């Protein structure tokens, strides 16, 4: 019995920010008069892009109130442009209270569709720029003895260019400078840019940036009290081709770049995917720790080295990670199973949900007793409802269910 998966029309994207669709705009060994200050980082950001045009609406809200979407990032550039005059350019930048920005930041069955399977593609996929140091994971006292120090450097070769790797960072940084604002500007419609830094190939120190948010206010007694926000994300993806991804967004046409491409250069539009959205500080504090997900996921690597070793009387981390009973690697490459194991981690973690736990579990436990059952037979019902109760709209525990599924027919 495969798991029956809901029907309904497709799920859409419910992630805290851009995953695969992202669009940075990104300044190289940067080295301006307050260079670490995201609002200078980001103004010089919006400063190398001279493709801007007049903005509007290319895939509607539907359910919101579009003309105030554009009016929120036209102001946007108004007080970036604003900030450019004044002789001594501000650390912060407090967005007026506009009515535009106070509607935004407020002062079902959905059957699986492919886009998260394709993201959790581009997740495990290697980019061109590196997004962590090398001694990044652990947080160890001492200095780890021998083995470990091995093994910590294989996987962080193999998953310091990791796309995954990127999300964590971007992750990192939009939750620490959301937390920090929240508590420090309690009261402001405060203007937070969406940064991330990488080395290139070359060793070059790049700062990126993905767009804007905004935050509402946020008096957060509690872990569980959220701070409402807007966010304002660069893409290149036209929102018309999956518009059910797309939902929860007002999708706007801001520019048009001048790419390199496999036919030489090309022009295409630059959109601006704009939605509103909430958080709470309890899960800012979980976002602040997404570098857990590359301790976790070298851990799982670990079990298996020490499972081999154990078997070998004899440390296995060398013959391990370079591939040296085991006759090939699955996935095709090493490199693959360790970001893989990451592509997990961090998409367990940027889509989080109840529905994702009760999955979790309750599908270890159906894993489990199916796994003594192919072993202990030839080929030839009350936990599955406890499954199915979780399988109502969320992308990645759809995802996953269709995965268990594939787990079945094999
Ligand atoms: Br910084 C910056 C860069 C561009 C714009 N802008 C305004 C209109 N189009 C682009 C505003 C601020």
């Not at 959905?110 to 399977?117: C, D, G, P, V, Y």
């Not at 203007?191 to 509402?216: A, D, H």
């Not at 154990?310 to 699955?330: A, L």
């Amino acid at each position: 019995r495969p798991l029956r998966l809901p029907d309904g029309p497709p799920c859409s994207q419910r992630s805290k920010f851009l995953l695969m669709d992202a669009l940075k705009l990104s300044i190289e060994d940067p080295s301006h008069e307050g260079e670490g200050i995201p609002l200078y980082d980001a103004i010089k950001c919006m400063r190398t892009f001279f493709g801007w045009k007049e903005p509007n609406v290319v895939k509607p809200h539907e359910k919101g109130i579009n003309p105030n979407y554009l009016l929120s990032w036209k102001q946007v550039l108004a007080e970036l442009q604003d900030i450019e005059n004044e002789e001594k350019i501000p650390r912060t930048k407090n967005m007026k209270k506009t009515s535009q920005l106070k509607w935004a930041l407020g002062e079902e069955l959905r059957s699986l569709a492919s886009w998260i399977q394709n993201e959790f593609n581009k997740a495990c996929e290697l980019t061109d720029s590196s997004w962590i140091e090398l001694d990044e994971i652990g947080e160890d006292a001492a200095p780890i003895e021998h083995i470990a120090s091995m093994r910590r450097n294989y996987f962080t070769a193999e998953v310091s260019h990791c796309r995954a790797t990127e999300y964590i960072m971007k992750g990192v940084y939009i939750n620490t400078a959301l937390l920090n604002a929240s508590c420090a500007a309690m009261d402001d419609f405060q203007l937070i840019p969406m940064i991330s830094k990488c080395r290139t190939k070359e060793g070059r120190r790049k700062t990126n940036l993905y767009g804007f948010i905004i935050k509402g206010r946020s008096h957060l007694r509690n872990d569980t009290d959220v701070v409402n926000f807007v966010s304002m994300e660069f893409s290149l993806t036209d929102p018309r081709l999956e518009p059910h991804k797309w939902e929860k967004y007002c999708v706007l046409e801001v520019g048009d770049m001048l790419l390199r491409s496999a036919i030489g250069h090309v022009s295409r539009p630059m959109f601006l995917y704009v939605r509103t959205n909430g958080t709470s500080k309890i899960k800012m504090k979980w976002g602040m720790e997404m570098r857990r997900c590359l301790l976790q996921s070298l851990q799982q690597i670990e079990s298996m080295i020490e499972a081999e070793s154990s078997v070998k009387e004899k440390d296995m981390t060398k013959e391990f990670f370079e591939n040296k009973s085991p006759k090939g690697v699955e996935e095709g490459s090493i490199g693959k199973v360790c970001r893989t194991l990451l592509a997990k981690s961090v998409f367990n973690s940027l889509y989080a949900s109840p529905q994702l736990e009760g999955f979790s579990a309750e599908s270890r436990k159906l894993l489990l007793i199916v796994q003594a059952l192919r072993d202990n037979l030839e080929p030839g019902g009350g936990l599955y409802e406890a499954i199915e109760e979780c399988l109502i709209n969320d992308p990645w525990v759809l995802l996953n269910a269709s995965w268990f599924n594939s787990f079945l027919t094999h």
